[PDB]
Structures are given as structure tokens and as C-alpha cells.
Write a protein that binds this ligand. Structure first.
Ligand code: CLA
Ligand code: CLA
Ligand code: CLA
Ligand code: CLA
Ligand code: CLA
Ligand code: CLA
Ligand SMILES: CCCCCCCCCCCCCCCCCC(=O)OC[C@H](CO[C@@H]1O[C@H](CO)[C@H](O)[C@H](O)[C@H]1O)OC(=O)CCCCCCCCCCCCCCCCC
Ligand SMILES: CC(=O)O[C@H]1CC(C)(C)C(=C=C/C(C)=C/C=C/C(C)=C/C=C/C=C(C)/C=C/C=C(\C)C(=O)C[C@@]23O[C@]2(C)C[C@@H](O)CC3(C)C)[C@](C)(O)C1
Ligand code: KC1
Ligand code: KC1
Ligand code: KC1
Lengths: 104, 34, 30, 164, 64, 211, 156, 154
């Protein structure tokens, strides 16, 4: 129960970050990939990671009523099951892009 | 830290470690035992 | 050299202070 | 919250801005947990500003840069590759959230309850002092990076001249 | 006994005869200071004896 | 309540007689009334009135306090000790170019600068540090302001971590000792600062004949 | 004072320092009046930074007056003072100059949706004029401090 | 404010129709006008012999400032903004004019006496100021309008 809730929350969260990475990977071609993380100074990552961590833990800029409509319970679980299926679809997709950058 | 200074510090540490502390511990043990 | 460190001022003031305190404390209590 | 841990002799209960008068319990527990961890990190930060001036690690963080080439201070941040810094954050972040390499049964001594609160106030007091120390270390280091010898104290660890 | 002006002044300084701290008191702190004094006396003896040679300390007659 | 009970275990026990029994405790009651002269009141200000006498106690305390600061002010300034930088950047007044002499420092310092010193004293005297009639004379620092206070039974700490409570009558550490030492150093500096003024008026040396 | 106008979802009852804690109702109305009046000037300050560029006014030339903090030295100090006291006529005594007498509409549910909208547009303007005053003053002492024009919007 | 030389001085009908609640507002308006005027009289004669040491604005020393109304335009307006606003904090809030030491513990009988010459000293000072900035303004526009060319006639 208690352990399953942590696995449940991690499954959703891992599926999310994979989704924003995919859309976040096509805007740059419209400083490319893993070559970019070394190009940006680590002081830049210190500011950005902690800003994500504020949203991740406290919900500073990521917990608002505009993102949670009332809707209805019949399609809520239908959309929430859809949240995982798209999350998994982006999850298995992601590894091929990082392995493409001169890896196995 | 010159070798003579290090030798003095080692001598003080050695005297406390293998003379003062073992004799005191033995005295405490035989005093509580007897 | 005789005027160094105030001259004779501190020994004169110091000796006068000791003599005045002894005379102040010399009297009986009541 | 006057009758809590952290009240010590020179000041007593220190709260001049009133940041704890109208707060609840759970924010105070978060405040003390923040104070304890801010102090613990600042205590290690003070140690981490002095030890590399004496001894360095022999290997390499990354194949490009070794430990000895890394300049001590805020100049260290840009010298080491950014991918290495991101791995350290999540490594100590795993111990921060879960405690993968912490919460061990050894290293947590059980003591007298009054002795335990005394050592806990000592832990807070050292952390509070090191938090003040980390501000001076960072202020002297960062300003000396922008303008070399801005304040005129040149050396990184100004108060310990025997290191240099 | 005679009461004098200075005697009345100095009276509280001699008014605590026989007052002790119960038990061992501060003997543990005193033993630490005695032990530190013993180590300090050995240091300055061995410096004078040239059994401890320091870095920039030369035990010989100095100038100025 | 939390983190305070370690003091009671670290507190040293009460002093006893050497035999084992409890120790029997077995003129100078007012601050400023001490061994050498006792109550030295040639003008009998205490006989003028209780309100008039309380005024003179606060008046001696205040006069003595500024005199101690004034004496220490000249002694460092006449020695050549200076703050680093400019006293007046608009007037090109470095601290090094301000004379150590009392009249020299009184004249060279700009009147706009002297106003700022005076207005700080006016602000302290009129609003911030007012004498409370209920409070003791000279107790003008309000609560909340960080001030070194020595209440009866305050804690001091020894080498092993043991705690001793200091009564008011303790030598060098009690409240009455520090209260008396403030009045007397104030009285001595009151004669000192006036003597340094007149000696410098006559000779130009505040600490004449020293120097 | 949680149950009062100005509470809006991102911050809620924003009071970290606790300046509204343990104050009487007269001080909060005073705080509210200072909240409103500071805001109202800041909206007009934002307007008074862009509109004196395109439109000018008819012993100092109105067009030659540089917009921003440089206007203070250009206008005579005596000429500045009767403007200051004229605003005080509408401030203390309330002798309305922008209007004749003042004709405000009152709609019950819109009153909550206007008064709350009034102070927070002013709150945003107060946050905005800090940048507007910073860029003008820092560039005046050092021409091209950040190497930018006077107004970040490009329609001038 | 009734003084023995004159009586209820009101020639233009400014106290009968108007109510007594707002008549107190003219009383503060009269007292504050006189208090400004009283300080302006002494404040007009002091800068002749003594001036402040430094500068008031960058490039504007205290010494090379005309004592009259030309000092208004000599000091920059932002300098005037700081001075006017600090005065208004005392004027409205009573920031630096509310200390209890400025309210002496006086018995009744000499109190309403002392308030009587307070507005009376300010009353002549209002007219005395009205001559001070008059002769200053005439001589500032055109030099030597009146026979005398001195700001203070004494
Ligand atoms: C975690 C998701 C993610 C990842 C891994 C990437 C990948 C990358 N992006 Mg990127 N991005 C994302 C999200 C992501 N993107 C999204 C959703 C968009 C569409 C708006 C973009 C648009 C974008 C831009 C415009 C740029 C990058 C850049 C980069 C590269 C530099 C490293 C970096 O992350 O800087 C991140 C730096 C950013 C400025 C990220 C922008 C994300 C914005 C602020 C939206 C996110 C906030 C929030 C979720 C929005 C919703 C709030 C509310 C309105 C509901 C790297 C390859 C930079 C690079 O130089 O190109 C190679 C660069 O300039 N991306
Ligand atoms: C992260 C830092 C941090 C946090 C969260 C706390 C938290 C706490 N402290 Mg505390 N402390 C700290 C660091 C901290 N401390 C430092 C550095 C000192 C030395 C000055 C102290 C000295 C101290 C004493 C002596 C006592 C406390 C007490 C407390 C408790 C109640 C007071 C309160 O409401 O705090 C809330 C804290 C915050 C809301 C965070 C601070 C935010 C302010 C605005 C920061 C101000 C800027 C700062 C000075 C940096 C300046 C940067 C410079 C460039 C300008 C609470 C558990 C009391 C106690 O422990 O419990 C009874 C107590 O007696 N503190
Ligand atoms: C992924 C890594 C990770 C994880 C999972 C955690 C886990 C946690 N931490 Mg750690 N932590 C990390 C990284 C991490 N930490 C690192 C690298 C350090 C330094 C060794 C710390 C030291 C630390 C402290 C001192 C505290 C935590 C707290 C917390 C908790 C609150 C969540 C949070 O971080 O707030 C998100 C962060 C914020 C809301 C503040 C971010 C802004 C600050 C000022 C940092 C930014 C500094 C900036 C980059 C430097 C430039 C400054 C300027 C020029 C821009 C959470 C349990 C807090 C706690 O336990 O209770 C409150 C707490 O006080 N952690
Ligand atoms: C950067 C990695 C990291 C971090 C953040 C910590 C964090 C901590 N550890 Mg762990 N430690 C680590 C690496 C780390 N450790 C590794 C690789 C080992 C195995 C050699 C250990 C073995 C270890 C022991 C044996 C103990 C700690 C203890 C601690 C605490 C002191 C602190 C919370 C102590 C503990 O966890 O709390 C009492 C303690 O007794 N650590
Ligand atoms: C003149 C400015 C001013 C004044 C008088 C007020 C006053 C008030 N605000 Mg409000 N506010 C302001 C500015 C102000 N605020 C700004 C700029 C914002 C946008 C961030 C807000 C956003 C805001 C919210 C979201 C809420 C309030 C609320 C309130 C009320 C209760 C809180 C309080 O006691 O504040 C007292 C404040 C003061 C006495 C002024 C403090 C000024 C500090 C010391 C300045 C600190 C420095 C500042 C950041 C500028 C730095 C510049 C730098 C270059 C030095 C009260 C009517 C609450 C509400 O509306 O009513 C229930 C509430 O929920 N305000
Ligand atoms: C320049 C601004 C200014 C203004 C317009 C005033 C105005 C006033 N003050 Mg303040 N004063 C000021 C600056 C000012 N003061 C400052 C900065 C301080 C702190 C040093 C004082 C300290 C002060 C005291 C101690 C007293 C005044 C008094 C007065 C009143 C009579 C002055 C004679 C008058 C209302 C008196 C007042 O408080 O009672 C009416 C009085 O006793 N003032
Ligand atoms: C106590 C103050 C003593 C003091 O320093 O006096 C200052 C006086 C200075 O003594 C002066 O010294 C000069 C030579 O240095 C000349 O001899 C002066 O005549 C002599 O008065 O010193 C002493 O009285 C000796 C103090 C010993 C203690
Ligand atoms: C006769 C009578 O009684 O009728 C009256 C009664 C009644 C109803 C009361 C009336 C009223 C009141 C009125 C007129 C109310 C008006 C409301 C008003 C005027 C509200 C504006 C918003 C300002 C903001 C938030 C600005 C933000 C600006 C922002 C976001 C900035 O960043 C500033 C900026 O500079 C930067 C930093 C960079 C630049 O690149 C861009 C700009 C310049 C934008 C009327 C209509 O008069 C009629
Ligand atoms: C730059 C850092 C940053 C991150 C990383 C981040 C992330 C998220 N934002 Mg946020 N955001 C800002 C910044 C950031 N946001 C600045 C204003 C702002 C405004 C809103 C509003 C109105 C909503 C909002 C949301 C989310 C949610 C998707 C994710 C977690 C929605 C929401 O909270 O869904 C429950 C929502 O309705 N945001
Ligand atoms: C921005 C700063 C500021 C504010 C906020 C402010 C406020 C008020 N002033 Mg003050 N005032 C100045 C500045 C400010 N005044 C300056 C620099 C001077 C010297 C030149 C000055 C002198 C007078 C005189 C002679 C009188 C006077 C009064 C009022 C009163 C009525 C409002 C009004 O009339 O404008 C309100 C509280 C009169 C009064 O109380 O009558 C009922 C009155 O007779 N003032
Ligand atoms: C087991 C899986 C694993 C792989 C496959 C892997 C690989 C690389 N790591 Mg390593 N790593 C760990 C594990 C793994 N690492 C662990 C458990 C820790 C915590 C002790 C850790 C810490 C650091 C730090 C501090 C740095 C670091 C680096 C590299 C880099 C070196 C070649 C390169 O430069 O690309 C290659 C990719 C450096 C870096 O990223 O520089 C850009 C760097 O500074 N790592």
C-alpha cells in the first residue's frame, strides 16, 4: 500500500518528464542535446534544477486550480488511464534518442 | 612540523596511550574487582 | 630624560594620593 | 515557540521579525528541519573551503580535468564539467529524500535525554555559526573572482594564513 | 578586637573562612590545567635543551 | 523548557562548610556608596528631596557615561588611531587629516557632521532611550535591544562545562560590582575629560605632561 | 485580515513578514489607503513615461524637457512646487481636479470585481515602475549602462 | 485669540456665517501659518552671517546660494522633493514632532496665556514675512526698486 503509492507516483512522474522532453527536443531545431548540458555552466543548472525542485516538492508554480478542472468521474479515470498510456509511450521512446548519441 | 617536534608529539601520545591509560584502566579494574 | 613619562608629576601625584588616603583612613570608626 | 530547542543564553528566544508567532506546528517543524539542514550543509561547506587547500583527491572527476587543476572556491563550479555536478546533486539528493546512504543504526548513539537535547542545541549553534561563516566565505570569494584583490585580502582563506 | 576604617573596608574579604565546594568540585579542570602546564614546561625545556628544534627558532644569542 | 534542563545537571552545588554543615552567610547599600568615602554628600542632596535625589543619580550616571566615552574618544584620537577612508567626501575630509586635538577635532569636523551626532543623541534622549520612572536610574535601554545584562543568579560557564550562578554581591561579576564600577569610572572620567580640556587649553596637549 | 479584498489565488493572503499582524482597524484602513494611492500613482507613472514622447505640451520649452528623471532638473524648482501643492489640494482636501466632482457607478457584485481589480493593476504597476525608475536612473549616471533605449517597447 | 488692543476682529464676515467646527480648522491654519512665518523670520536673517559647510547638491555649495527667494531655484527640485516630503511627514503623521518633552506640564492659568502670544507672535510674523519676501521679490526681478538694497534692514 504505502510502497505502491510511491511506485504509483513515480510511474506518473517518469511518464510526464519524458513527454516534455520530446516536445522540448523538437523546438530547438525549429547546444543541441547531451552536448548542450556541458555547454551550459553548472551555475545555470544550479538555478534551474532548484526551480524545478521547488515545483516538484512544494508546488510553487505548478499547483493551481486552472490545471484541475471539475470534469466528471467517468472520463477522469479514462483520461488518467490515458495519462499513463501516453506516459509509457513517451517513456520507451526516450531511451532511443539518448542511445542514438554515440551509444549502444 | 620538524622531525624533532613530531617525535615529541609522538612521545607524548605514546606515553598517554601505552603507559598512563593502561595503568589507570588496570587500576580501575582491580579496584572494582577486589 | 628628567621630563620623560610626565616628569616628576606622576610620582608627586602618586605619593600625595597615598599620603592622603592613609590620613583619610587613620581616624577611628566612630 | 519560546519553550523549544534553540533557545540559548546570549540572546534567548530570537525572533525579532515575528516569523514564528502566528505560524502552526508543521511549518515550525519544517523551519527547524530547514535550520538543521542549512546548518549541517554550511558546516560541511566551511570544512570544504579549507581541506582542498591542504589535500586534494588523486584521481579525475572527468577525463578532461583532474582534482588538482580545479581552483578552490566558486571558481570550482565552472571548472568541473556540468554533467558531473548534476550527478552529485542527485546522489546527495537520494540521501536527502530517501536516505540511501544514511539512517544507519550505527552512528546514532542513544544518550541521556537531557544530554541529547544539549547536544542538539550544540548542533544547532554550530550550524547557525557556520551559516554566518559561509556568507563571509562566499562574499570574499565571489567578489575576489570579479575584481581580483577587491577587498585587499587576496587569499581565499583569509583567517588561516598558515595554509599559505 | 579593634575596628579600624580600613579593617571595616577589608572585612568581607576575610569573612569566608572554611567555605568549600562540596565533593570533588573543580578538581577535574585543575588536573587538566596541571597536565597542560606539565606538557608546556617540557616543551620549553626541550627547546632550551635543543631536543626540540623548531623551524625558525635558533637557540643562540640574537642581535637587536 | 526544551534544551534547558542540562543546566541544572551542570550546575555546581551550593557551597558548604568544610566540616560538612551548611555554610552560615554572616553602610554600602546604594550604587556609588563604596568603601573609601562611603556616602560622600557634602551638599546634602539626599536631604533636598526624594525626587531631587533621583534626578541627581540619573544626572551623575548620564554625565559619567558621556565622560567615559569622551575620555576614550580623545585617547584613541590623540594617539593617531583613525577610521579608514573619508569623513567627508564632499569636503575632501579624510580621517587622517582631522587633528587629534580636542579643539582641533571639534573644529575640523563639519557642522553638518556634528548635527548628525547631536540628532542621534536627541533621538536617543527623547524617544528611544527614555528613563522609565519605574525602572532603575540609568536603565534606559529597552527590552528587545541586545544589551549585556547581569541579573541576580545569571549563569557563567567553567572549563568542564559546569555552570555557576553569580549573585549580585559577587566580586568582579555581580551586578553591584559592575554598577559601582560604571559610576566610579564615570566619576573619574568626569574629572578626566575636564582636566584634558583645560590642559589642552593651556598647553595644546590633552594628556599633559604625558607625550 | 484574511477576509478582505485583495486575496487572489497565486499568493492568497500574502503577508510573510506579518506587517498586518496585530494592528487595529484604523491602521489597516490606513494601510489600504496607502496600498491604493501608491498603486494609483504607479499606473499614472507608467502612462507618464510613454505618452509624453508622442505628445508634447504647448519660461521653459515643454518639448525640450527630457522625459524621465531628467525632467526634474529641467523644470524650475519653484515651478515644481506649485504642482506638488496642487496635487495636495486633491489629496488632503479632496478638491477634485481630474474630475469636476466625481461620478462613480456602484454595482454590488461588480464592486468586488472592480476594487480588487483596481489595487492589483496598481500592484503590478508598482512592481513595474521600479524597473522603469531603475532603467532611467542607472542610464542617466552611466549612458548605456545596459545598452538599451529608454522604453523597452518598440513602438516609439 | 482675543487680545485687549482690538476685539473680535472680523471685518469681511468670515466668522459669523461659518460654523465653529470648521472655525477650529482655520485655527490650526492660522497657528501653522504663524509657526511657519515665525521660523521664516529667523530663517531669513541667519544665512547672512552663517552658512552650512558642505554642498547641498552635486556642484551646488551652500556658500554660493542667494539668501532670498532665488534659493528656491538654486537648489534642484529633487532636493526640494526630499525636504518637502520630510516636512509633510512631520506635518501629517507627526513623525518628529510628537515627543512628550515638547508638551510641558503646565498648570491651566499660564497655559491659555502662553497660547495667546503664540498665535500673536505668529500673527505679526505673518505680516513681517509678508514684507520679507516682498522686498526680496521686488529687488530680485529688477535691481534696486526700493531705496534700500539690503534683504535685512538691520
Ligand atoms: C524537461 C523538458 C525539456 C528538455 C529536456 C528540453 C531540452 C532542451 N531544451 Mg527545451 N523546451 C521545453 C522543455 C524541454 N526542453 C518545452 C516544453 C519547450 C516549448 C516551449 C521548450 C523550448 C526550448 C527553448 C526555447 C530552448 C530550449 C533549449 C533546450 C536545450 C538546453 C537545455 C535545457 O533544458 O534548457 C531549458 C531552457 C529553457 C528556456 C526551457 C524552456 C521551457 C519553458 C520555459 C516552458 C516550461 C515552463 C512550464 C512547464 C510551462 C507551463 C507553465 C504554465 C504556462 C502552464 C535542451 C536540449 C534551449 C537551447 O538553447 O536550445 C538547444 C532553448 O533556448 N527548449
Ligand atoms: C535557513 C536559515 C534558518 C531557518 C529556516 C531558521 C529557523 C528558525 N530559527 Mg534560527 N538562525 C539561523 C538560520 C535559520 N533559522 C542563522 C544563520 C542564525 C544566526 C543569526 C540563527 C539564529 C537563531 C536563534 C538564536 C534562534 C533561532 C530560532 C529559529 C526558529 C524560530 C525563528 C523563525 O521564525 O525562523 C524563520 C526563518 C525563516 C523564515 C528564514 C529566514 C528568512 C529571512 C528573511 C532571511 C533574511 C536574510 C538573511 C539575513 C541573509 C542576508 C543576505 C545578505 C546578502 C543581505 C526557527 C526554527 C529560535 C529557535 O531555534 O527556536 C525556539 C532561536 O532561539 N535562530
Ligand atoms: C535532486 C536533489 C535533491 C532532493 C530530492 C532534495 C530533497 C529535499 N531537500 Mg536538499 N539539497 C540538494 C538537492 C536535493 N534535495 C543539494 C544539492 C543541497 C546542498 C548540498 C541540498 C541541501 C538542502 C537544504 C539546505 C534544504 C534542503 C531541503 C530539501 C527538501 C525540500 C525540497 C527542496 O529542495 O526545495 C526546493 C528549493 C527551494 C524551494 C529553494 C531554492 C532556492 C535556494 C536559494 C537555492 C538556490 C541557490 C542558487 C542556485 C545559487 C545562486 C543564487 C543566486 C545567484 C541565484 C527535500 C526533502 C530543505 C528542507 O529540508 O526543508 C525546508 C532545506 O532547507 N536540501
Ligand atoms: C555523497 C554521498 C553520501 C551522502 C550525502 C551521505 C550522507 C550521510 N551519511 Mg553516508 N556513506 C557514503 C556516502 C554518503 N553519505 C558511502 C559511499 C558509504 C559507504 C562507504 C557511506 C557510509 C556511511 C556510514 C557508515 C554512516 C554514514 C552516515 C551519513 C550521515 C553523516 C549523512 C546523512 C552516518 C549515518 O548514516 O547516520 C547516523 C553513518 O553512521 N555513511
Ligand atoms: C506602498 C505599498 C504597499 C502597501 C501600503 C501595502 C499594504 C497592504 N497590502 Mg499589499 N502589495 C504591494 C505594496 C503594498 N502593500 C506590492 C508592490 C504588491 C505586489 C507584490 C502587493 C501585493 C499584496 C497582496 C497579494 C496582498 C497585499 C495585502 C496588503 C495589506 C496587508 C499586508 C500588509 O500589512 O502590508 C504592509 C506593507 C507595508 C507597510 C509596506 C512595506 C514596504 C516594505 C518594507 C518594502 C520592502 C522592499 C520592497 C520589496 C521594495 C524594494 C526596493 C529596493 C530597490 C530597495 C495592506 C493593505 C493583502 C491584501 O491585499 O489585504 C488583505 C494581500 O493579500 N499586498
Ligand atoms: C527637519 C524635519 C523636522 C521638522 C519639520 C520638525 C518639527 C518639529 N519638531 Mg523635530 N526633529 C527632527 C526633525 C524635524 N522636526 C529630527 C530628525 C529629530 C530627531 C533628532 C527631531 C527631534 C525633536 C524633538 C526632541 C522635539 C522636536 C520638536 C519639533 C516641533 C518644534 C520644533 C522646535 C516641530 C513640530 C518638539 C516636539 O516634539 O514637541 C512639539 C521637540 O521637543 N523634534
Ligand atoms: C603607576 C604609575 C607610575 C608611572 O608610570 O610613573 C611614571 C614615572 C616616570 O618617572 C619619571 O621618569 C623619568 C625617567 O624615565 C625621570 O626620572 C623623572 O624624574 C621621573 O619622574 O615612573 C615611575 O614613577 C616608576 C614606576 C615604577 C612602577
Ligand atoms: C467624469 C468621471 O467622473 O468619470 C470618470 C470616472 C471613472 C470611471 C472612475 C474613470 C476612471 C478611472 C481610470 C481612468 C482608470 C484607468 C485605469 C488604468 C489607466 C490602468 C492601467 C494599467 C497600468 C499598468 C498595470 C501598467 C503596467 C505596465 C507594465 C506591465 C510594464 O511593464 C511597464 C512598461 O514600462 C515597461 C517596464 C517596459 C515597456 O516596454 C512597457 C511598459 C511601458 C508597459 C474615468 C474613465 O476617468 C471616468
Ligand atoms: C519556470 C518554472 C515553472 C515550472 C517548472 C512550471 C510547471 C508547471 N506549471 Mg507553472 N507557472 C510558472 C512557472 C513554472 N511552471 C510561472 C507562472 C505559472 C502559472 C501557472 C498556471 C496558472 C498553471 C501552471 C501549471 C504548471 C504545471 C503544468 C507544471 C507543474 C498548471 C498547474 O498548476 O496544474 C495543476 C496551471 O494551471 N503554471
Ligand atoms: C508633501 C508634504 C506635505 C504634506 C503631506 C502637508 C500636509 C498638510 N499641510 Mg503642510 N506644508 C508643507 C508640506 C506638506 N504639508 C511644507 C513644505 C510647508 C512649508 C512651506 C507647509 C506649510 C503649511 C502651512 C502654513 C499649512 C499647512 C497645512 C497642511 C495640512 C492641510 C493640507 C493643506 O492645506 O495643503 C496638511 C496636513 C495647513 C493646515 O493645517 O490648515 C488646515 C496650513 O495652514 N502646511
Ligand atoms: C554506473 C553507471 C555510470 C555510468 C555509465 C557513468 C558514466 C560517466 N560518469 Mg559517472 N557516476 C556514477 C555512475 C556512472 N557514471 C556514480 C554512481 C557516481 C557517484 C559516485 C558518479 C559521479 C560522477 C561525477 C562527479 C562525474 C561523473 C562523470 C561520468 C562520465 C565520465 C566520462 C565523460 O566525461 O563523459 C561518464 C559518462 C563525469 C562527467 O559527467 O563529465 C562530463 C563527472 O564529472 N560521474
Amino acid at each position: 500500500e504505502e510502497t505502491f503509492a510511491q511506485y504509483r507516483t513515480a510511474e506518473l512522474k517518469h511518464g510526464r518528464v519524458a513527454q516534455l522532453c520530446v516536445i522540448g527536443y523538437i523546438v530547438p531545431e525549429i547546444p543541441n542535446g547531451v552536448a548542450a548540458i556541458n555547454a551550459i555552466p553548472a551555475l545555470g543548472w544550479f538555478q534551474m534544477v532548484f526551480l524545478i525542485g521547488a515545483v516538484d516538492y512544494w508546488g510553487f508554480l505548478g499547483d493551481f486550480e486552472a490545471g484541475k478542472p471539475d470534469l466528471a468521474p467517468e472520463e477522469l479515470e479514462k483520461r488518467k488511464l490515458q495519462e499513463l498510456q501516453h506516459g509509457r509511450l513517451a517513456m520507451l521512446a526516450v531511451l532511443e534518442l539518448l542511445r542514438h548519441d554515440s551509444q549502444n | 612540523m620538524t622531525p624533532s617536534l613530531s617525535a615529541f608529539l609522538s612521545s607524548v601520545i605514546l606515553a598517554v596511550v601505552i603507559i598512563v591509560i593502561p595503568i589507570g584502566a588496570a587500576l580501575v579494574f582491580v579496584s572494582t574487582s577486589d | 630624560n628628567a621630563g620623560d613619562f610626565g616628569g616628576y608629576t606622576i610620582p608627586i601625584i602618586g605619593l600625595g594620593l597615598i599620603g592622603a588616603t592613609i590620613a583619610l583612613l587613620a581616624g577611628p570608626v566612630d | 515557540y519560546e519553550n523549544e530547542l534553540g533557545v540559548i543564553e546570549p540572546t534567548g528566544f530570537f525572533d525579532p521579525l515575528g516569523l514564528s508567532a502566528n505560524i502552526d506546528e508543521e511549518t515550525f517543524a519544517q523551519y527547524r528541519t530547514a535550520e538543521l539542514k542549512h546548518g549541517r550543509v554550511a558546516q560541511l561547506c566551511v570544512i570544504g573551503y579549507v581541506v582542498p587547500e591542504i589535500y586534494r583527491f588523486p584521481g579525475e572527476i572527468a577525463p578532461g580535468v583532474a582534482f588538482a587543476d580545479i581552483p578552490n572556491g566558486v571558481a570550482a563550479i565552472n571548472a568541473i564539467p556540468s554533467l558531473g555536478w548534476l550527478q552529485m546533486i542527485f546522489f546527495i539528493g537520494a540521501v536527502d529524500y530517501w536516505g540511501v546512504l544514511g539512517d544507519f543504526d550505527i552512528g546514532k548513539p542513544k544518550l541521556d535525554p537531557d544530554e541529547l537535547e544539549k547536544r542538539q542545541v550544540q548542533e544547532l549553534q554550530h550550524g547557525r555559526l557556520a551559516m554566518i561563516a559561509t556568507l563571509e566565505l562566499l562574499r570574499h570569494d565571489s567578489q575576489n573572482l570579479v575584481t581580483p584583490g577587491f577587498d585587499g585580502l587576496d587569499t581565499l582563506i583569509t583567517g588561516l594564513p598558515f595554509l599559505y | 578586637a579593634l575596628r579600624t576604617r580600613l579593617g571595616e573596608i577589608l572585612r568581607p574579604l576575610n569573612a569566608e573562612y572554611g567555605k568549600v565546594a562540596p565533593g570533588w568540585g573543580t578538581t577535574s579542570v585543575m588536573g587538566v590545567f596541571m597536565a597542560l602546564f606539565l606538557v608546556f614546561l617540557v616543551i620549553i625545556l626541550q627547546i632550551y635543551n635543543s631536543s626540540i628544534i623548531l623551524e625558525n627558532v635558533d637557540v643562540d644569542w640574537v642581535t637587536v | 523548557a526544551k534544551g534547558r534542563g542540562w543546566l541544572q545537571k551542570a550546575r555546581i552545588a551550593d557551597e558548604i562548610d568544610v566540616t560538612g554543615s551548611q555554610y552560615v552567610n554572616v553602610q554600602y547599600d546604594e550604587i556609588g556608596v563604596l568603601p573609601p568615602l562611603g556616602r560622600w554628600d557634602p551638599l546634602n542632596i539626599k536631604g533636598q528631596g526624594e525626587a531631587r535625589y533621583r534626578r541627581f543619580v540619573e544626572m551623575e550616571i548620564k554625565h559619567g557615561r558621556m565622560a567615559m566615552a569622551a575620555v576614550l574618544g580623545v585617547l584613541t584620537t590623540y594617539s593617531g588611531i583613525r577610521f579608514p577612508g573619508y569623513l567627508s567626501k564632499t569636503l575632501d575630509l579624510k580621517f587622517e587629516d582631522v587633528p587629534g586635538t580636542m579643539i582641533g577635532s571639534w573644529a575640523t569636523v563639519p557642522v553638518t557632521g556634528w548635527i548628525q551626532i547631536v540628532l542621534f543623541v536627541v533621538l536617543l534622549e527623547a524617544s528611544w532611550w527614555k528613563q522609565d520612572p519605574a525602572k532603575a536610574p540609568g536603565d534606559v535601554v529597552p527590552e528587545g535591544v541586545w544589551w549585556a545584562r547581569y541579573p541576580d543568579g545569571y549563569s557563567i560557564f567553567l572549563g568542564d562545562g559546569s555552570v555557576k550562578t553569580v549573585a549580585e554581591d559577587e566580586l568582579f561579576l555581580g551586578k553591584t560590582w559592575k554598577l559601582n564600577a560604571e559610576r566610579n569610572n564615570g566619576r573619574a572620567a568626569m574629572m578626566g575629560i575636564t582636566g584634558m580640556y583645560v590642559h589642552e587649553l593651556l598647553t595644546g596637549n590633552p594628556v599633559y605632561p604625558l607625550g
